[PDB]
Amino acid sequence: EKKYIVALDQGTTSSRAVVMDHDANIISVSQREFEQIYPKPGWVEHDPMEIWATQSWTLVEVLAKADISSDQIAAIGITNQRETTIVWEKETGKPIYNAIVWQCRRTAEICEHLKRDGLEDYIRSNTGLVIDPYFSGTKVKWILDHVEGSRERARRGELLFGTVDTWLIWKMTQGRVHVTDYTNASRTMLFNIHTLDWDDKMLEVLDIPREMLPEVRRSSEVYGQTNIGTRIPISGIAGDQQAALFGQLCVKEGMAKNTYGTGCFMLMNTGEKAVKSENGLLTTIACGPTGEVNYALEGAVFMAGASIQWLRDEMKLINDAYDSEYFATKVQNTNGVYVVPAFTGLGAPYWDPYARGAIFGLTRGVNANHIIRATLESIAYQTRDVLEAMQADSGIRLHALRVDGGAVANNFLMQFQSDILGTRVERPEVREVTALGAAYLAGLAVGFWQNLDELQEKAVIEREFRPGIETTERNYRYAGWKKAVKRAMAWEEH
Amino acid sequence: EKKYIVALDQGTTSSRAVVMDHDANIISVSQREFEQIYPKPGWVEHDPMEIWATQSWTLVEVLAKADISSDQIAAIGITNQRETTIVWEKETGKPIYNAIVWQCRRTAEICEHLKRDGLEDYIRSNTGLVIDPYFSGTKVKWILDHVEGSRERARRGELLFGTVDTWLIWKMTQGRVHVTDYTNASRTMLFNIHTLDWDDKMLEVLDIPREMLPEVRRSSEVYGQTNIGTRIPISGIAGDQQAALFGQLCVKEGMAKNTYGTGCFMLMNTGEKAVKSENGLLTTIACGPTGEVNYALEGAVFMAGASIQWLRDEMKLINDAYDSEYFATKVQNTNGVYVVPAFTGLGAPYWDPYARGAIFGLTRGVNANHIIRATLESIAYQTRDVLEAMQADSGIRLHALRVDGGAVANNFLMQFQSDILGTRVERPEVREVTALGAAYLAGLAVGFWQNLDELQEKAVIEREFRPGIETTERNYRYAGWKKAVKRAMAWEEH
Ligand SMILES: Nc1ncnc2c1ncn2[C@@H]1O[C@H](COP(=O)(O)OP(=O)(O)C(F)(F)P(=O)(O)O)[C@@H](O)[C@H]1O
Numbered sequence: 001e002k003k004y005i006v007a008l009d010q011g012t013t014s015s016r017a018v019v020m021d022h023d024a025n026i027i028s029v030s031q032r033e034f035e036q037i038y039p040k041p042g043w044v045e046h047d048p049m050e051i052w053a054t055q056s057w058t059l060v061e062v063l064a065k066a067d068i069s070s071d072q073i074a075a076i077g078i079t080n081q082r083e084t085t086i087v088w089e090k091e092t093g094k095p096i097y098n099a100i101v102w103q104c105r106r107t108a109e110i111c112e113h114l115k116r117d118g119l120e121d122y123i124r125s126n127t128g129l130v131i132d133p134y135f136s137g138t139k140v141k142w143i144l145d146h147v148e149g150s151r152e153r154a155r156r157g158e159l160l161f162g163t164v165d166t167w168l169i170w171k172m173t174q175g176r177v178h179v180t181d182y183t184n185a186s187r188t189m190l191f192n193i194h195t196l197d198w199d200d201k202m203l204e205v206l207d208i209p210r211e212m213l214p215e216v217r218r219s220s221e222v223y224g225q226t227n228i229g230t231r232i233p234i235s236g237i238a239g240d241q242q243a244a245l246f247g248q249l250c251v252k253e254g255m256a257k258n259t260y261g262t263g264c265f266m267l268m269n270t271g272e273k274a275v276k277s278e279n280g281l282l283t284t285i286a287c288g289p290t291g292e293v294n295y296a297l298e299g300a301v302f303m304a305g306a307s308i309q310w311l312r313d314e315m316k317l318i319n320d321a322y323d324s325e326y327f328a329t330k331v332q333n334t335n336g337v338y339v340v341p342a343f344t345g346l347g348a349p350y351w352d353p354y355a356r357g358a359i360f361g362l363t364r365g366v367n368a369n370h371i372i373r374a375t376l377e378s379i380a381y382q383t384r385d386v387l388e389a390m391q392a393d394s395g396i397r398l399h400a401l402r403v404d405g406g407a408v409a410n411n412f413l414m415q416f417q418s419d420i421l422g423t424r425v426e427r428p429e430v431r432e433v434t435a436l437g438a439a440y441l442a443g444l445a446v447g448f449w450q451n452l453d454e455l456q457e458k459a460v461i462e463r464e465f466r467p468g469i470e471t472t473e474r475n476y477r478y479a480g481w482k483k484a485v486k487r488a489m490a491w492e493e494h
Numbered sequence: 495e496k497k498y499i500v501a502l503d504q505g506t507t508s509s510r511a512v513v514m515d516h517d518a519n520i521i522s523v524s525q526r527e528f529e530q531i532y533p534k535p536g537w538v539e540h541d542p543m544e545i546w547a548t549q550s551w552t553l554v555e556v557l558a559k560a561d562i563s564s565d566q567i568a569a570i571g572i573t574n575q576r577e578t579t580i581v582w583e584k585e586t587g588k589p590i591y592n593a594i595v596w597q598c599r600r601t602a603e604i605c606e607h608l609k610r611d612g613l614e615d616y617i618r619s620n621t622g623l624v625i626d627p628y629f630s631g632t633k634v635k636w637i638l639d640h641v642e643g644s645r646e647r648a649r650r651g652e653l654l655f656g657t658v659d660t661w662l663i664w665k666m667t668q669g670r671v672h673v674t675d676y677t678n679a680s681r682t683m684l685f686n687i688h689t690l691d692w693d694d695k696m697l698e699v700l701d702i703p704r705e706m707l708p709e710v711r712r713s714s715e716v717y718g719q720t721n722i723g724t725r726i727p728i729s730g731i732a733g734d735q736q737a738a739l740f741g742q743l744c745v746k747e748g749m750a751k752n753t754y755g756t757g758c759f760m761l762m763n764t765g766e767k768a769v770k771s772e773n774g775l776l777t778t779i780a781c782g783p784t785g786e787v788n789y790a791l792e793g794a795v796f797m798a799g800a801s802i803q804w805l806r807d808e809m810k811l812i813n814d815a816y817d818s819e820y821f822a823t824k825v826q827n828t829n830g831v832y833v834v835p836a837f838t839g840l841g842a843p844y845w846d847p848y849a850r851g852a853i854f855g856l857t858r859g860v861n862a863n864h865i866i867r868a869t870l871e872s873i874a875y876q877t878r879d880v881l882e883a884m885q886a887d888s889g890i891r892l893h894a895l896r897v898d899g900g901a902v903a904n905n906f907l908m909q910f911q912s913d914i915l916g917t918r919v920e921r922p923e924v925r926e927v928t929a930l931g932a933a934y935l936a937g938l939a940v941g942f943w944q945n946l947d948e949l950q951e952k953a954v955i956e957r958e959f960r961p962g963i964e965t966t967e968r969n970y971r972y973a974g975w976k977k978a979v980k981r982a983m984a985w986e987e988h
């Protein structure tokens with residue numbers, strides 16, 4: 001009858017579809033890439049439809065290449081890229097402006113206004129965030145103020161607003177459901193998180209009409225059905241990381257993971273209670289073992305695998321993210337070069353929308369390889385950067401870090417990472433922790449599963465990475481790292 | 495009968511040989527490239543024989559290929575790379591160590607000492623220089639000390655020192671002559687230049703035996719005979735830059751040219767007076783209209799052509815320096831990017847030995863072309879940098895700049911250059927202004943010519959580049975450009 005579950009994964013750079021059984025075997029994976037738009041430097045947008053569309057095929061493609069049918073699948077779980085904002089016409093169902101991606105820095109001006117109205121605490125306090133173009137509020141506004149009647153219709157509930165999940169579903173369900181889960185909500189900067197609700201302040205301050213907002217639900221709950229046909233349901237939602245966190249089973253106080261993808265997101269579960277960053281981190285909403293509200297401590301790094309695609313597609317120093325390793329090991333060292341991936345400003349712990357990407361310490365003998373190497377390395381520095389914040393904030397000492405994502409395939413990387421950390425790295429056996437995540441939720445929200453210690457056996461550690469560099473070595477580098485960073489901040493002119 | 499003359503060109507990267515007639519038509523060019531030696535990072539040497547060997551090839555190689563004989567050529571003008579130092583066993587006639595190119599930065603330590611001892615002013619005052627591993631003073635020393643007997647023999651006038659010319663000649667004349675000209679001398683940082691003579695201070699300070707020094711002569715003068723056979727004269731000696739300056743016929747007060755080669759050198763004649771740089775420039779000895787001491791304002795820029803070869807040889811973004819334009823033109827603008835060619839530290843006006851090269855304002859959508867482009871652009875920024883100081887010091891307004899060098903072939907460049915300068919650029923009909931210069935001088939010396947107004951014809955302007963950018967536009971750029979530099983300065987840790 002119904003043997004499977006499908007995870008949906010709307011990623012910064014590609015749409016994905018995953019399929020799995022009760023044993024949680026990942027049966028099949030469809031996956032179509034979409035176009036990144038830089039309307040202008042420090043700006044990033046997506047095509048909502050292209051999003052949409054490319055999300056719609058993976059669906060099929062998967063189904064279709066498994067000979068699976070609408071019927072053997074119970075539910076549909078849903079993860080997405082987290083901060084990215086959409087606003088569309090509702091009668092009509094059409095974007096009134098391209099998605100603004102999280103990484104996009106165009107809301108900086110704004111952001112500044114907020115800053116000198118003493119709003120930092122309220123935000124920091126109610127939202128758990130920080131003032132930055134990262135989060136949606138600003139985004140939304142920006143739009144508002146760029147479309148003409150916008151607020152009007154906004155107001156005649158003529159206009160609709162949502163994040164990716166919210167948008168997908170609206171799409172799946174033709175127009176039936178206008179909701180979102182907490183995690184995601186948590187990310188807008190217009191939602192009190194000791195309140196689990198929209199926040200008037202924000203709402204007004206940002207001058208956003210309550211009418212374009214969606215309902216806010218629990219991460220694993222039945223939100224409705226899709227005519228896949230043959231009606232399928234949707235009982236899962238999360239923003240990628242939190243989704244990822246879950247899949248990693250970092251479902252109890254002090255469990256942290258690091259993920260490696262377009263960017264970097266180090267998260268650590270705070271359990272029931274919300275810890276407050278003192279060190280540039282974020283306090284957000286997570287998942288309890290039951291799909292119930294939990295809290296986390298989050299470090300968000302904007303550039304990571306990304307710096308690598310860059311290499312590949314723009315610079316074209318390589319042809320394969322894959323290849324980076326080889327080249328990098330072609331050299332002994334970075335030869336003093338340092339790369340700062342601030343293509344979209346800085347971000348945590350720094351939070352500097354003006355920093356821009358940079359390369360340093362160039363010497364006439366430096367070559368493509370050094371460059372390449374340097375780029376990988378930047379991933380690692382960055383991670384440490386945040387890692388300490390986490391400690392600082394958490395008041396914990398991780399003795400191991402469990403990672404995951406695309407790049408962990410990179411041993412050199414991995415290795416180097418542990419080296420600079422002075423801590424061991426753990427590479428799980430399975431690899432789609434995020435979809436693992438979104439499914440569980442969805443299946444958990446459906447009887448398809450009725451507990452985690454079930455799925456608990458997939459937390460196998462394939463690889464263990466041990467540091468092999470001494471305490472000076474390390475710091476020595478970190479130091480030059482830090483040096484380089486300073487130099488990249490405040491590039492942009494406000 | 496003796497229809498021609500010969501220019502010898504010992505360049506940083508190859509030895510050349512040029513031939514011409516009374517109309518100064520350049521008749522033939524031989525040219526073997528020689529090997530660069532980077533003993534280690536920051537270090538550069540050449541094989542003094544290689545240098546030698548090549549040069550001769552070039553010589554001969556020529557005549558042969560024109561069926562010209564020792565008999566139809568009047569003289570031999572001579573030009574070379576400027577700070578590069580030699581020291582050889584005089585009986586033996588052999589180098590006691592590889593040459594050390596102006597380029598090389600190994601005389602770093604030393605420089606500092608002197609720095610300590612408070613000589614800036616004496617130097618700046620009596621040599622027209624500044625402290626730096628650039629000029630040979632230090633160089634020599636450096637050697638001295640690494641070689642055992644050295645100073646002894648030095649002292650016993652047993653050991654010989656010279657610059658490329660100096661050396662070259664010794665070679666030509668077998669051992670007969672040991673002279674140098676002014677311009678070149680004026681480079682060593684051991685020669686008073688309102689004294690037209692060595693400097694005891696220096697000499698002692700640098701701890702060098704006066705013995706090993708050569709006779710310092712006028713640039714356009716008879717120095718000896720080479721048996722090429724059939725005894726040919728050598729009435730020409732200027733440093734490739736003054737050489738070029740000459741060939742560009744900037745032989746009177748306030749005339750300047752900017753050369754575009756492995757580096758950049760902008761020289762402005764002060765006629766009969768050595769004026770003091772208040773702004774990071776050099777006071778150096780040049781050529782009056784007869785081969786007679788003149789003065790000049792110089793801005794030396796370390797990285798130019800080089801940045802482009804770097805591009806081609808190490809980054810591999812290109813295959814041809816040639817190509818650089820087609821690529822550059824591919825994009826519309828630098829995309830906010832800035833490249834700082836401080837592969838060797840800075841240099842004029844800056845003079846920062848700690849500067850390291852770097853790239854700036856990276857954005858996810860930036861690509862190799864943008865990078866490339868920027869690289870050329872830097873070459874212009876750089877030129878204005880100095881242009882300004884010149885004005886400053888010079889107390890003059892160039893309405894037109896007369897360039898020359900390889901790159902002047904790059905239209906994009908030339909044009910950009912004019913646009914950023916907000917000044918007109920003039921590209922000459924002929925292209926080896928350098929050889930030119932030396933061939934005059936020599937022939938002049940030998941009364942092969944009687945006036946320059948007989949070659950004032952070869953000063954045909956092939957192209958005039960007019961600025962076509964608004965003032966803002968301009969300043970806008972330059973600004974970012976300096977932002978960059980500041981950031982690049984002082985990278986290296988001392
Ligand atoms: N061998 C490798 N070495 C280095 N980086 C690699 C390697 N293989 C993949 N990567 C990088 O990891 C990321 C790809 O895998 P991943 O599954 O994590 O995509 P995702 O993380 O799902 C995403 F962020 F890209 P998106 O939001 O687009 O889905 C890319 O940035 C890619 O460069």
Ligand SMILES: Nc1ncnc2c1ncn2[C@@H]1O[C@H](COP(=O)(O)OP(=O)(O)C(F)(F)P(=O)(O)O)[C@@H](O)[C@H]1O
Pocket residue numbers: 505506507508734754755756757798799800801802803815816818819899900901903904
């Ligand atoms: N078309 C071009 N556009 C840009 N850069 C160019 C172009 N052609 C050559 N280059 C650069 O020009 C330089 C060569 O200039 P040029 O040949 O006139 O001086 P050269 O005498 O050869 C010397 F520079 F080697 P040098 O005298 O410093 O030893 C190189 O460093 C190369 O990158």
Ligand SMILES: [Mg+2]
Pocket residue numbers: 009010011012240261434
């Ligand atoms: Mg993803």
Ligand SMILES: [Mg+2]
Pocket residue numbers: 505734755928
């Ligand atoms: Mg030259």
